[PDB]
mmCIF file of C-alpha atoms (C1' of nucleotides) in Angstrom:
data_model
loop_
_atom_site.group_PDB
_atom_site.id
_atom_site.type_symbol
_atom_site.label_atom_id
_atom_site.label_comp_id
_atom_site.label_asym_id
_atom_site.label_seq_id
_atom_site.Cartn_x
_atom_site.Cartn_y
_atom_site.Cartn_z
ATOM 1 C CA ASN U 1 0.015 -0.071 -0.237
ATOM 2 C CA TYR U 2 2.787 2.395 0.621
ATOM 3 C CA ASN U 3 3.015 4.881 -2.047
ATOM 4 C CA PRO U 4 5.905 7.424 -1.736
ATOM 5 C CA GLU U 5 4.670 9.096 -5.029
ATOM 6 C CA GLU U 6 2.516 10.876 -2.853
ATOM 7 C CA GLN U 7 5.348 13.774 -2.107
ATOM 8 C CA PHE U 8 4.417 16.529 0.268
ATOM 9 C CA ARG U 9 6.914 19.515 0.993
ATOM 10 C CA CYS U 10 7.008 19.881 4.815
ATOM 11 C CA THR U 11 9.350 22.348 6.347
ATOM 12 C CA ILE U 12 11.116 23.443 9.617
ATOM 13 C CA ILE U 13 12.688 26.660 10.054
ATOM 14 C CA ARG U 14 15.894 27.571 7.945
ATOM 15 C CA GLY U 15 18.645 27.520 10.103
ATOM 16 C CA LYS U 16 20.986 30.367 11.185
ATOM 17 C CA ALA U 17 23.242 28.996 13.839
ATOM 18 C CA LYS U 18 24.985 25.735 12.525
ATOM 19 C CA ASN U 19 28.257 27.066 11.452
ATOM 20 C CA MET U 20 28.821 29.128 14.530
ATOM 21 C CA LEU U 21 26.787 27.079 17.072
ATOM 22 C CA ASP U 22 29.618 26.559 19.817
ATOM 23 C CA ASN U 23 29.811 30.412 19.903
ATOM 24 C CA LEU U 24 25.901 31.068 19.080
ATOM 25 C CA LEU U 25 24.162 28.919 21.541
ATOM 26 C CA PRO U 26 25.867 30.318 24.609
ATOM 27 C CA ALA U 27 24.893 33.509 23.513
ATOM 28 C CA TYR U 28 21.589 33.131 22.920
ATOM 29 C CA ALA U 29 21.341 31.165 26.342
ATOM 30 C CA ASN U 30 23.369 33.732 27.977
ATOM 31 C CA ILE U 31 21.501 36.897 26.814
ATOM 32 C CA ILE U 32 18.170 35.142 27.888
ATOM 33 C CA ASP U 33 19.198 34.204 31.152
ATOM 34 C CA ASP U 34 20.474 37.705 31.840
ATOM 35 C CA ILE U 35 17.748 39.815 30.603
ATOM 36 C CA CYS U 36 14.929 37.528 31.628
ATOM 37 C CA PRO U 37 12.537 37.964 33.385
ATOM 38 C CA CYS U 38 11.473 41.258 31.520
ATOM 39 C CA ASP U 39 8.703 42.871 29.361
ATOM 40 C CA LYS U 40 8.496 42.436 25.893
ATOM 41 C CA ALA U 41 9.574 45.749 25.093
ATOM 42 C CA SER U 42 12.743 45.520 26.805
ATOM 43 C CA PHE U 43 13.448 41.986 25.633
ATOM 44 C CA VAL U 44 13.252 42.882 22.082
ATOM 45 C CA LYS U 45 15.581 45.978 22.430
ATOM 46 C CA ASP U 46 18.186 44.062 24.962
ATOM 47 C CA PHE U 47 18.324 40.877 23.172
ATOM 48 C CA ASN U 48 19.135 42.725 19.714
ATOM 49 C CA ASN U 49 21.812 44.897 21.402
ATOM 50 C CA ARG U 50 23.160 42.017 23.060
ATOM 51 C CA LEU U 51 23.352 39.479 19.817
ATOM 52 C CA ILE U 52 24.836 42.476 17.464
ATOM 53 C CA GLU U 53 27.981 42.308 19.748
ATOM 54 C CA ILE U 54 28.350 38.521 18.313
ATOM 55 C CA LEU U 55 27.105 38.590 14.643
ATOM 56 C CA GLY U 56 28.588 41.879 13.899
ATOM 57 C CA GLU U 57 27.872 45.742 13.840
ATOM 58 C CA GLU U 58 26.870 45.559 10.215
ATOM 59 C CA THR U 59 24.125 42.938 10.908
ATOM 60 C CA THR U 60 20.804 44.362 10.157
ATOM 61 C CA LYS U 61 17.762 44.898 12.654
ATOM 62 C CA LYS U 62 15.820 42.296 10.599
ATOM 63 C CA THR U 63 18.703 39.878 11.038
ATOM 64 C CA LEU U 64 18.606 40.544 14.596
ATOM 65 C CA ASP U 65 15.074 40.218 14.786
ATOM 66 C CA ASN U 66 14.900 36.956 12.578
ATOM 67 C CA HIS U 67 17.423 35.289 15.010
ATOM 68 C CA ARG U 68 15.388 36.292 17.991
ATOM 69 C CA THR U 69 11.946 35.024 16.681
ATOM 70 C CA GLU U 70 12.743 32.157 14.556
ATOM 71 C CA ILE U 71 16.025 30.352 16.069
ATOM 72 C CA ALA U 72 16.152 31.583 19.699
ATOM 73 C CA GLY U 73 12.135 31.524 20.154
ATOM 74 C CA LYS U 74 11.045 28.827 17.645
ATOM 75 C CA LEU U 75 13.247 26.570 16.429
ATOM 76 C CA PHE U 76 15.487 25.980 19.522
ATOM 77 C CA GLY U 77 12.472 26.846 22.002
ATOM 78 C CA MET U 78 14.592 29.084 24.365
ATOM 79 C CA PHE U 79 12.080 31.396 25.655
ATOM 80 C CA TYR U 80 8.462 31.970 26.256
ATOM 81 C CA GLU U 81 5.914 34.300 27.027
ATOM 82 C CA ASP U 82 3.378 34.451 30.033
ATOM 83 C CA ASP U 83 1.495 37.310 31.323
ATOM 84 C CA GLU U 84 3.160 39.995 29.440
ATOM 85 C CA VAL U 85 6.517 38.625 30.894
ATOM 86 C CA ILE U 86 9.379 36.992 28.812
ATOM 87 C CA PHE U 87 11.078 33.708 30.483
ATOM 88 C CA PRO U 88 13.840 31.654 29.811
ATOM 89 C CA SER U 89 12.608 28.184 28.936
ATOM 90 C CA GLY U 90 13.064 24.860 30.882
ATOM 91 C CA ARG U 91 15.333 24.111 27.801
ATOM 92 C CA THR U 92 17.619 26.985 28.252
ATOM 93 C CA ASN U 93 17.365 26.582 32.074
ATOM 94 C CA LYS U 94 18.912 23.182 31.785
ATOM 95 C CA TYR U 95 21.738 24.143 29.267
ATOM 96 C CA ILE U 96 22.471 26.825 31.703
ATOM 97 C CA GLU U 97 23.298 24.283 34.243
ATOM 98 C CA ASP U 98 25.123 21.662 32.394
ATOM 99 C CA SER U 99 26.266 23.057 28.901
ATOM 100 C CA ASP U 100 25.386 19.664 27.359
ATOM 101 C CA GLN U 101 24.773 20.681 23.672
ATOM 102 C CA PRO U 102 24.124 17.174 22.720
ATOM 103 C CA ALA U 103 21.237 16.805 25.511
ATOM 104 C CA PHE U 104 19.883 20.163 24.270
ATOM 105 C CA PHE U 105 19.369 18.883 20.636
ATOM 106 C CA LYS U 106 18.202 15.339 21.943
ATOM 107 C CA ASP U 107 15.298 17.237 23.423
ATOM 108 C CA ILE U 108 14.572 18.954 20.601
ATOM 109 C CA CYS U 109 14.167 15.771 18.210
ATOM 110 C CA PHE U 110 12.532 14.085 21.176
ATOM 111 C CA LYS U 111 9.821 16.706 21.058
ATOM 112 C CA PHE U 112 9.574 17.543 17.425
ATOM 113 C CA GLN U 113 6.713 16.727 15.333
ATOM 114 C CA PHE U 114 4.572 17.820 12.424
ATOM 115 C CA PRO U 115 2.393 19.608 12.795
ATOM 116 C CA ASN U 116 3.480 22.268 15.118
ATOM 117 C CA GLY U 117 3.364 25.814 16.408
ATOM 118 C CA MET U 118 6.816 26.861 14.866
ATOM 119 C CA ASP U 119 5.028 27.525 11.453
ATOM 120 C CA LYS U 120 3.390 30.262 10.045
ATOM 121 C CA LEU U 121 -0.693 30.008 10.312
ATOM 122 C CA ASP U 122 -1.259 29.447 6.674
ATOM 123 C CA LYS U 123 1.435 26.608 6.814
ATOM 124 C CA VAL U 124 -0.237 24.848 9.836
ATOM 125 C CA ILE U 125 -3.354 24.988 8.278
ATOM 126 C CA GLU U 126 -1.877 23.286 5.284
ATOM 127 C CA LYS U 127 -0.363 20.732 7.269
ATOM 128 C CA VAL U 128 -3.408 20.291 9.231
ATOM 129 C CA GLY U 129 -5.363 19.956 5.946
ATOM 130 C CA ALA U 130 -3.257 17.499 4.865
ATOM 131 C CA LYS U 131 -3.925 15.163 8.080
ATOM 132 C CA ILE U 132 -0.024 15.407 8.879
ATOM 133 C CA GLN U 133 0.853 13.862 12.289
ATOM 134 C CA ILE U 134 4.313 12.104 12.963
ATOM 135 C CA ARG U 135 7.032 12.349 15.437
ATOM 136 C CA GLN U 136 9.787 12.529 12.433
ATOM 137 C CA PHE U 137 13.048 11.817 14.676
ATOM 138 C CA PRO U 138 11.659 8.719 16.423
ATOM 139 C CA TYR U 139 10.482 7.373 13.125
ATOM 140 C CA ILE U 140 13.821 8.287 11.092
ATOM 141 C CA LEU U 141 15.755 6.339 14.026
ATOM 142 C CA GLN U 142 13.378 3.420 13.362
ATOM 143 C CA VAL U 143 13.877 3.722 9.847
ATOM 144 C CA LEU U 144 17.404 3.505 10.225
ATOM 145 C CA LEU U 145 17.489 0.654 12.550
ATOM 146 C CA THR U 146 15.428 -1.337 10.288
ATOM 147 C CA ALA U 147 17.692 -0.496 7.315
ATOM 148 C CA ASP U 148 20.703 -1.653 9.431
ATOM 149 C CA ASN U 149 18.345 -5.024 10.031
ATOM 150 C CA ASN U 150 18.548 -5.320 6.267
ATOM 151 C CA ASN U 151 22.201 -4.766 5.840
ATOM 152 C CA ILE U 152 21.450 -1.757 3.675
ATOM 153 C CA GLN U 153 22.759 1.632 4.291
ATOM 154 C CA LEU U 154 20.344 4.800 3.462
ATOM 155 C CA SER U 155 21.254 8.154 1.981
ATOM 156 C CA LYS U 156 20.235 11.550 2.462
ATOM 157 C CA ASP U 157 18.154 11.408 -0.696
ATOM 158 C CA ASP U 158 16.648 8.270 0.573
ATOM 159 C CA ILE U 159 15.156 9.858 3.909
ATOM 160 C CA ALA U 160 14.248 12.684 2.080
ATOM 161 C CA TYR U 161 12.120 11.166 -0.843
ATOM 162 C CA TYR U 162 11.081 8.032 1.289
ATOM 163 C CA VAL U 163 10.548 9.668 4.904
ATOM 164 C CA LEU U 164 10.776 13.555 5.076
ATOM 165 C CA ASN U 165 8.644 14.519 1.924
ATOM 166 C CA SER U 166 6.689 11.364 1.636
ATOM 167 C CA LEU U 167 2.780 12.345 2.534
ATOM 168 C CA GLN U 168 1.959 8.939 3.922
ATOM 169 C CA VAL U 169 4.685 8.814 6.055
ATOM 170 C CA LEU U 170 4.102 12.124 7.516
ATOM 171 C CA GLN U 171 0.319 11.244 7.844
ATOM 172 C CA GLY U 172 1.835 8.433 10.266
ATOM 173 C CA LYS U 173 0.135 5.669 8.197
ATOM 174 C CA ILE U 174 3.408 3.668 7.305
ATOM 175 C CA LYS U 175 5.410 1.370 9.063
ATOM 176 C CA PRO U 176 9.155 1.669 8.841
ATOM 177 C CA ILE U 177 9.478 -1.754 7.334
ATOM 178 C CA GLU U 178 7.622 -0.898 4.647
ATOM 179 C CA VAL U 179 9.569 1.831 3.851
ATOM 180 C CA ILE U 180 12.637 -0.399 3.873
ATOM 181 C CA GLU U 181 10.977 -2.867 1.750
ATOM 182 C CA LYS U 182 10.313 -0.188 -1.260
ATOM 183 C CA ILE U 183 13.626 1.260 -0.837
ATOM 184 C CA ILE U 184 14.903 -2.342 -1.481
ATOM 185 C CA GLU U 185 12.378 -3.083 -4.250
ATOM 186 C CA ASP U 186 13.353 0.180 -6.184
ATOM 187 C CA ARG U 187 17.082 -0.439 -5.877
ATOM 188 C CA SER U 188 16.476 -3.942 -7.489
ATOM 189 C CA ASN U 189 14.828 -2.183 -10.328
ATOM 190 C CA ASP U 190 17.791 0.364 -10.543
ATOM 191 C CA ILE U 191 15.724 3.237 -9.528
ATOM 192 C CA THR U 192 17.229 5.942 -7.682
ATOM 193 C CA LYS U 193 14.675 8.427 -6.147
ATOM 194 C CA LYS U 194 15.385 12.163 -5.019
ATOM 195 C CA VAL U 195 12.881 14.930 -3.936
ATOM 196 C CA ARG U 196 12.532 17.496 -6.902
ATOM 197 C CA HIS U 197 10.516 20.510 -7.564
ATOM 198 C CA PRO U 198 10.068 21.946 -10.929
ATOM 199 C CA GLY U 199 11.989 25.010 -11.704
ATOM 200 C CA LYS U 200 13.391 25.483 -7.782
ATOM 201 C CA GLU U 201 16.948 25.604 -6.418
ATOM 202 C CA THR U 202 18.288 22.611 -4.097
ATOM 203 C CA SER U 203 17.865 24.231 -1.123
ATOM 204 C CA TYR U 204 14.047 24.724 -1.733
ATOM 205 C CA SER U 205 13.697 21.000 -1.896
ATOM 206 C CA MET U 206 16.461 19.862 0.563
ATOM 207 C CA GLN U 207 17.499 22.482 3.119
ATOM 208 C CA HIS U 208 15.002 21.349 5.775
ATOM 209 C CA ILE U 209 15.337 17.838 5.102
ATOM 210 C CA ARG U 210 19.554 18.382 5.457
ATOM 211 C CA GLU U 211 18.934 20.185 8.725
ATOM 212 C CA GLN U 212 16.531 18.025 10.228
ATOM 213 C CA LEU U 213 19.519 15.552 10.053
ATOM 214 C CA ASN U 214 21.826 18.308 11.237
ATOM 215 C CA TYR U 215 20.033 18.402 14.737
ATOM 216 C CA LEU U 216 19.628 14.699 14.833
ATOM 217 C CA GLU U 217 23.688 14.555 14.412
ATOM 218 C CA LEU U 218 24.227 17.520 16.928
ATOM 219 C CA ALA U 219 22.061 15.052 19.534
ATOM 220 C CA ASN U 220 24.779 12.555 18.778
ATOM 221 C CA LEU U 221 22.269 9.840 17.506
ATOM 222 C CA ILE U 222 23.654 9.670 13.829
ATOM 223 C CA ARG U 223 26.799 10.811 11.486
ATOM 224 C CA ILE U 224 26.243 12.052 8.075
ATOM 225 C CA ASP U 225 29.064 10.574 6.186
ATOM 226 C CA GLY U 226 29.266 11.628 2.694
ATOM 227 C CA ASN U 227 25.982 10.605 1.312
ATOM 228 C CA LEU U 228 25.082 8.460 3.947
ATOM 229 C CA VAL U 229 23.178 8.641 7.202
ATOM 230 C CA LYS U 230 24.488 6.067 9.945
ATOM 231 C CA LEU U 231 23.605 5.523 13.363
ATOM 232 C CA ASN U 232 25.900 6.379 16.357
ATOM 233 C CA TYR U 233 25.821 3.027 18.213
ATOM 234 C CA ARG U 234 28.065 4.502 21.126
ATOM 235 C CA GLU U 235 24.041 6.011 21.610
ATOM 236 C CA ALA U 236 22.645 2.902 20.929
ATOM 237 C CA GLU U 237 20.739 2.982 24.455
ATOM 238 C CA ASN U 238 19.308 6.549 23.515
ATOM 239 C CA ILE U 239 18.620 5.599 19.871
ATOM 240 C CA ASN U 240 16.372 2.704 20.806
ATOM 241 C CA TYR U 241 14.595 4.479 23.660
ATOM 242 C CA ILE U 242 13.508 7.121 21.045
ATOM 243 C CA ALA U 243 13.028 5.028 18.132
ATOM 244 C CA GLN U 244 10.158 3.211 20.156
ATOM 245 C CA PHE U 245 7.982 6.475 19.675
ATOM 246 C CA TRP U 246 7.895 5.980 15.861
ATOM 247 C CA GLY U 247 4.391 5.453 15.626
ATOM 248 C CA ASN U 248 2.874 7.298 18.568
ATOM 249 C CA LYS U 249 0.574 10.128 17.744
ATOM 250 C CA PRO U 250 2.268 13.542 18.331
ATOM 251 C CA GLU U 251 2.096 14.442 21.627
ATOM 252 C CA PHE U 252 0.901 17.801 21.113
ATOM 253 C CA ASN U 253 -2.259 17.559 19.262
ATOM 254 C CA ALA U 254 -2.834 20.254 16.657
ATOM 255 C CA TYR U 255 -6.230 18.870 15.631
ATOM 256 C CA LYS U 256 -8.064 19.960 18.534
ATOM 257 C CA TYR U 257 -7.954 23.683 17.652
ATOM 258 C CA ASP U 258 -10.436 25.452 15.588
ATOM 259 C CA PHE U 259 -8.201 27.708 13.324
ATOM 260 C CA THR U 260 -10.735 30.206 12.254
ATOM 261 C CA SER U 261 -11.175 31.104 15.810
ATOM 262 C CA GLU U 262 -8.835 34.141 16.947
ATOM 263 C CA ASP U 263 -9.030 32.564 20.622
ATOM 264 C CA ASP U 264 -7.751 29.178 19.509
ATOM 265 C CA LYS U 265 -5.136 30.594 17.134
ATOM 266 C CA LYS U 266 -3.649 32.570 20.237
ATOM 267 C CA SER U 267 -4.159 29.407 22.345
ATOM 268 C CA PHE U 268 -2.269 26.989 19.796
ATOM 269 C CA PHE U 269 0.930 28.848 19.286
ATOM 270 C CA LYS U 270 1.282 29.564 23.202
ATOM 271 C CA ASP U 271 0.264 25.637 23.829
ATOM 272 C CA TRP U 272 2.777 24.593 21.439
ATOM 273 C CA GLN U 273 5.302 26.708 23.179
ATOM 274 C CA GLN U 274 4.866 25.829 26.642
ATOM 275 C CA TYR U 275 4.833 22.146 25.286
ATOM 276 C CA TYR U 276 8.153 22.497 23.203
ATOM 277 C CA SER U 277 10.287 24.794 25.082
ATOM 278 C CA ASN U 278 9.299 23.646 28.890
ATOM 279 C CA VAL U 279 9.276 20.515 30.996
ATOM 280 C CA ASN U 280 5.836 19.211 31.323
ATOM 281 C "C1'" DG Z 1 0.286 50.602 8.775
ATOM 282 C "C1'" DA Z 2 7.612 37.044 11.748
ATOM 283 C "C1'" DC Z 3 8.358 32.701 9.643
ATOM 284 C "C1'" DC Z 4 9.316 32.116 4.504
ATOM 285 C "C1'" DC Z 5 12.881 31.045 1.089
ATOM 286 C "C1'" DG Z 6 15.719 33.657 -3.024
ATOM 287 C "C1'" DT Z 7 19.891 34.337 -3.569
ATOM 288 C "C1'" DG Z 8 24.975 34.087 -3.302
ATOM 289 C "C1'" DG Z 9 29.488 34.282 -0.135
ATOM 290 C "C1'" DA Z 10 31.899 30.932 2.149
ATOM 291 C "C1'" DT I 1 27.906 22.152 -1.653
ATOM 292 C "C1'" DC I 2 26.548 24.584 2.827
ATOM 293 C "C1'" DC I 3 23.887 27.683 4.989
ATOM 294 C "C1'" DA I 4 22.341 31.964 6.530
ATOM 295 C "C1'" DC I 5 21.257 37.292 5.297
ATOM 296 C "C1'" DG I 6 17.423 39.834 4.995
ATOM 297 C "C1'" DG I 7 13.790 40.946 1.577
ATOM 298 C "C1'" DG I 8 9.568 38.098 0.358
ATOM 299 C "C1'" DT I 9 4.843 37.471 1.578
ATOM 300 C "C1'" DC I 10 -1.435 35.644 15.872
#
DNA sequence: GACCCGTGGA
DNA sequence: TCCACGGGTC
């Protein structure tokens, strides 16, 4: 039944901190820890004024704002808002205590899901309309385990086409063994599949897929070795613990919100941040 | 009257 | 090839 030909582009936020992460993650965390708790006006000012010291004086305000909202706020879940005040998140609070970068990204991978409240509303509505519901990192790990069970290695293009851009997989309808069987079948017929979009550049098609893999690698659970994606079995216990959730519905239920209600829209994004960034 | 993603330096 | 600036488009 599994048909990967049903393709669906499903993004995550585009990164800004990979190259300089070892400097930027402490900066984000220390800025937030230092200036919070504070009101939103003070947060916006003081965060940008601190970050520009790190990124460089030519950095535009728009870039500073985008770091704050897209990466420190949404993708890395490092602060949240409650009662007009901005606070350091539980994830930040932990990192401030232990400086454990792999654990930071393991938590991100554990909690990530589609749909989520990182996306713009029109994209959320698109993903909900497509009945997307997946914990993608548990799923990827089980797919990699199953590939190893079967003595094959998967490429980034395999993960892209058959998992992270496959509608049926993103819908939570497919078992990892079905994916591996299909990949083995296509290979035997000399079929190599890649994600393609007409007239679009490779970043459009693949950057969010490569960057999802980057965060799994920063969590120390995989290695991207050239074209191939390989488990790090020095973390076999963690790999198996997280993989167990491959078939679980997302912990955060996007489907109980009425996105025509202004109150439910507000609740949705707030509730998402609480789930993703804090301890529950 | 803030994520998305074209675009190009690294 | 990788990935992030900053303009593009609740």
